[PDB]
Amino acid sequence: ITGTSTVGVGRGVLGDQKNINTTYSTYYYLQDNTRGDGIFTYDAKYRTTLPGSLWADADNQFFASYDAPAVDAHYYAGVTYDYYKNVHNRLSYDGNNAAIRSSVHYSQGYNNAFWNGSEMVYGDGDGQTFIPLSGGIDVVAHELTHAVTDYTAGLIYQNESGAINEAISDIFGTLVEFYANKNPDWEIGEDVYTPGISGDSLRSMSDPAKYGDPDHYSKRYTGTQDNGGVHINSGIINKAAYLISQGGTHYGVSVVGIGRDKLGKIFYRALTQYLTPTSNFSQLRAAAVQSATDLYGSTSQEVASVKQAFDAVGVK
Ligand SMILES: CC(C)C[C@H](NP(=O)(O)[C@H](Cc1ccccc1)NC(=O)OCc1ccccc1)C(=O)N[C@@H](C)C(=O)O
Ligand SMILES: [Ca+2]
Ligand SMILES: [Ca+2]
Ligand SMILES: [Ca+2]
Ligand SMILES: [Ca+2]
Ligand SMILES: [Zn+2]
Structure with missing residues (x-):
């Protein structure tokens, strides 16, 4: 998406309020232009087809329950990029600022998250064994780190x-x-x-x-x-x-x-x-x-x- 960088606000899976980096072009998208070649979050709509639709919102406010997992996947992926950069001086997972992509609402009651060799994917959980997986920062970082491993040791x-x-x-x-x-x-x-x-x-x-x-x-x-x-x-x-x-x-x-x-x-x-x-x-x-x-x-x-x-x- 080509547009104007801005900042939106939402609530995560745990009910915590956070600011997220978005892009404005008619709708407000979950596209953060501030880190490397961007961080992009997609809606998989309960299907298994990937990545799904780049996340679009009308008003830059992400407080709906359906919004929660996208907010956290988008924000935690930002934190992880920062950790790597600041602490180990590595630019994104490939070390050359590759765009980071994540899809949320993957399948129905999917109790897992993974790195598929190209992007991160998060289930919503079945509500008992797990709640939506992107609500855990150790989870998001675990996934992203598989990308890191993919490009280094392999x-x-x-x-x-x-x-x-x-x-x-x-x-x-x-x-x-x-x-x-x-x-x-x-x-x-x-x-x-x-x-x-x-x-x-x-x-x-x-x-x-x-x-x-x-x-x-x-x-x-x-x-x-x-x-x-x-x-x-x-x-x-x-x-x-x-x-x-x-x-x-x-x-x-x-x-x-x-x-x-x-x-x-x-x-x-x-x-x-x-x-x-x-x-x-x-x-x-x-x-x-x-x-x-x-x-x-x-x-x-x-x-x-x-x-x-x-x-x-x-x-x-
Ligand atoms: C941190 C926790 C929440 C999520 C984490 N997922 P995970 O990150 O370990 C996920 C597991 C998986 C494998 C195959 C298909 C689907 C999912 N594996 C995964 O993402 O594998 C990375 C990989 C990259 C390339 C080739 C092969 C593998 C985990 O420990 N999953 C346990 C529950 C499990 O899968 O047994
Ligand atoms: Ca909204
Ligand atoms: Ca528990
Ligand atoms: Ca932990
Ligand atoms: Ca903890
Ligand atoms: Zn793993």
Whole structure:
């Protein structure tokens, strides 16, 4: 859409009011011209055909319940672009300011969200297991981070490389949640999962076992479902990342925490410079150690905490 940049206001899925970047050309569109080559949000109209219609509104006010998921997908995608730019100096997911596209109201009662190799897609959930998925900033950032991975390491979505792919998305979705300071935590999906149960989440990084995910390599899932447990074994890496940042004793192994910022710097460097499509857990360990070495020196405490954290989860 070619038009005049302006700012509209709406309410998100959680009932929170926010300003969003729109474009005016007869209607007001969910097109933010301020970030890279733009951020664009589409209405999939309960169908599965993508992307759907660029979101158009008559008055630049998005307070209807139908508007909620589009407001949050549009606004959180803005925050995520900013995190990447400001913190890691990366311009959009491809590093060359590629337009970011998202479709909301995808299918009927669809309990998931994904990156399809071209855009982000969000279901509205069925109202019980999930509310519309774009209402969680860790969710939006998890999705966008799959694009990041797609353009850098390219980790294949199966087995070990696939669980690394998922962990990276959980790690960066969490870093983005802390960056926006939106009630942050080490839980995934808490804001949009089981609206009727408080205190739970989809996955836990601090304690993956809490929901039955492995927190040690010896407890790795070897089966075939979930692409070989991409969403299951990611708990072993999530726990490792949580220990590097926060510290703790796990299975008798003590880890001094080095904090979140350094965790983000070490992981980003591993992702962009050392990981490949078929990298496994042991290779992730070498990649993380080498990044911390690059950045802080072989004799750093940073390097020391990365080795302990992997030794704690039984990776090497
Ligand atoms: C953060 C949470 C809310 C959403 C997140 N979705 P997700 O981001 O893990 C979504 C899962 C999926 C896979 C295939 C089809 C459709 C959906 N996968 C996805 O987007 O995969 C990225 C990918 C890119 C290229 C090739 C292959 C894969 C998730 O953990 N989903 C769990 C519930 C699951 O799918 O098992
Ligand atoms: Ca309106
Ligand atoms: Ca939170
Ligand atoms: Ca969270
Ligand atoms: Ca819940
Ligand atoms: Zn994922």
